[PDB]
Amino acid sequence: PPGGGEQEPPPPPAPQDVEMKEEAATGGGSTGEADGKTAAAAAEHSQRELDTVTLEDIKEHVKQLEKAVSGKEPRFVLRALRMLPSTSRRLNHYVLYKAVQGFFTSNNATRDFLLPFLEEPMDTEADLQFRPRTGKAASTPLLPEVEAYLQLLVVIFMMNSKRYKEAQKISDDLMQKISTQNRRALDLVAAKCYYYHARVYEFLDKLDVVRSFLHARLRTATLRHDADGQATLLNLLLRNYLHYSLYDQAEKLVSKSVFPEQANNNEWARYLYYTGRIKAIQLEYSEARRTMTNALRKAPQHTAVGFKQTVHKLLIVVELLLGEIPDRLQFRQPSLKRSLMPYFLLTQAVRTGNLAKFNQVLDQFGEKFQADGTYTLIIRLRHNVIKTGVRMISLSYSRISLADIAQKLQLDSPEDAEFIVAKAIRDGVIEASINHEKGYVQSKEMIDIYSTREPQLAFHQRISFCLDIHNMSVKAMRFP
Amino acid sequence: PKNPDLRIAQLRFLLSLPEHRGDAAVRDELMAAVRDNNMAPYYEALCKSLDWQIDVDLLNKMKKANEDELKRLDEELEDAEKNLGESEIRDAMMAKAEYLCRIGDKEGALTAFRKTYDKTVALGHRLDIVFYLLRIGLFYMDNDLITRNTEKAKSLIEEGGDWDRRNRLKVYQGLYCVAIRDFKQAAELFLDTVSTFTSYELMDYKTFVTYTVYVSMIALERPDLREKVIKGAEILEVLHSLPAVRQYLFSLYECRYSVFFQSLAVVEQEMKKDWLFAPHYRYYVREMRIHAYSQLLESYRSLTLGYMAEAFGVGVEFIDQELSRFIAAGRLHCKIDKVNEIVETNRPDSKNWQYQETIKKGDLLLNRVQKLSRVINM
Amino acid sequence: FSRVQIEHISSLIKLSKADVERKLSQMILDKKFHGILDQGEGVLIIFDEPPVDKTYEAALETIQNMSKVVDSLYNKAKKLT
């Protein structure tokens, strides 16, 4: 008891400092950054806000609970106040409440007091200049609080932050003028709590009412604030719309646009994983392997944790349907390994041309196939076994009888033996010629050609268009 | 001061991988445990091998008496430093504590290595230290510390010059290149052959002869192979003593394929029971397939398999499934025809592969620059 | 003469066809003799396309240019974290 009682005081001072000065220096600094320059944006405290939010998402967040200075909620949410020279007095009132909190119990517990608190900024009337400061002062307690998952009486409080964000959405439909430089930070912050829309709604069932609401927000941002807005909202669309049918494959067709410019960073890569599974549902394997590889290869630096391992998991799925895959056991991480353990023997069965080896993988690992969600291609891969199996043996064997190859091709009658190779040439597999009497399959090859034209002529536009973009970057980054 | 414990580490490999030896491996382990008075090594061996019955007071009084031999040295260091001399004090405590660390783990070892690092003015004692990191790295199969001691020693050795100990290091780096997969550097650094003679750090000289003659058949060219074994004057006798590998050498040049898999069976059986050769045999075998079949097909562009089947015993339908299944694995790709009786080789791949490295390397090259291009800025 | 029969070229060298085929093919094994024989009709043909030089230049550039972007991995991924 004395140890646990005296170890309570040490923890709070760290949130009492960094959690106090995180939105004070970044938010209060963004106030001066929003008064002028305001180029672009930039508003570098918006990306610094991303660093602080992602910092809280690990440790320590804020709420909890935690029974440490719950008076931080009324601190920033009250006392604009009101015009800038009067706000300076309230800038001293934060220090006044620092002394009040340094004297008495400092209101270490709020809970049901969030009802007057969250409505106090509406009692001030008003900030009135910066809506992102009002939305952030209310959300910063509540957004990390969603990670508690208590599911009692505070879920509707998260919904109240969603209503405050809807007031941020109506103000996202009006001003401007003309030229809002704070709406990019509103795109950032709202995309977060739009994913908190996803989490809080997913506590019970699908959000479908918010699918028409997201389409209302996604379309009302057109065309003005779509920049960096439409990208995050399209992932908010694509993610759960990939979980719930339907039509998103043809919906993103008419939705594009592209939509440029890609922001922010890994956002477009993860979008190419989301739409990567989409474009993989059309089964064209050149665009699917390029969108899946570009999804993972374009994402630094992690941690955390396993969904960046999931894009790598589903990445080589289209490579399994290509007919040739390397053994990936050397790419296993300490985490991704234990997650894909069935998928290991799966791609090992894809390398081999044995049917029973692949079918036993299906019967045993079908439970993990339910966990991943990819099924339909597991039964049709038997056609990849007959095409890779015939690619194997044909190129392999000098002249193979249709009765001897019939074991690995499982039928290979005297009739279909013609089509196996012939319709493989239709798919561009093997050139083997067969004169059918008994018969026997005599595989030869003569090709000397290509390896030339498209690679070098495309490399011209590749390199040139690249260095042109690198011009568009460097030439435009010299403002300082 | 190595081979006794080197055999213990070899006995660890004899216990670890094969599960079918329950008698001789533990017997001679105890025969080597009752000597050198090992403590920490028999703890790891106690968990892997049998737990007895009882050790307890036996090796605890042996570690108590060795502690008296440990405490007579560790209480002599303050009595020796009472006087003053050059290395006549600390050279006793650096080598004997490494013998006291030979009793267990890395502790006295690493702490004496950096201890004496600031004292010895001669490279011979520094290389003896290097020998201690190499033996303790060989027992625990740790390749991290065997690179650093040699990298620091060679600068002092190559400043520089040596005869014997330079050939010793060539055997070391040859054992490290063969510990991981390096085919060329193992035989190239073992080209010294008999000039190393026999040493306690080189263990059995016949085993070293088998190490260089087993690794010289892969990455070395066929004219260079017979130039090493046949033209080599000193290496020819020591490889002649064992007919197992010598039969594989002269029959590989004789091109006869009827003795190959039997001679390779004896070679592979020796490859299985030797340490550090376990990961490398899987590629080593199929490499000997494409090695012997490279001179099989190169005889004639269009070859009649009837002439192949003349003396095989029997190669009529065997080379069909044999070579084919080796073609399907990627070893010696060729297009062969039957009932036309034409084995056609080729395949030169002088067009695709000639220009393929451009687009191939350029794929991942331009990919890796596409990452860094589209990541920044934003 | 590139294309030649094996029996009358063994008459010029004055040797049996068995060790003429195996020695000449052994010369192809040494790469000093450019060509190949034909056992079916008893023919020996010489052909060559020596220059690899452009592939050497290509490979030397791009294979090292791998490590080039690896070197740029240090700087351009340092600004991130």
């Binding site: 390199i463 260095l467 | 451009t358 | 230049e57």
Partner: peptide
Amino acid sequence: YLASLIRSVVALHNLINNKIANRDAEKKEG
């Protein structure tokens, strides 16, 4: 073929070095 080789060399040098001196000038001044 040589043209594509100069493309890779020119793009490698110029793009890497320019982005280096670019990102450095921005992060140091800003």
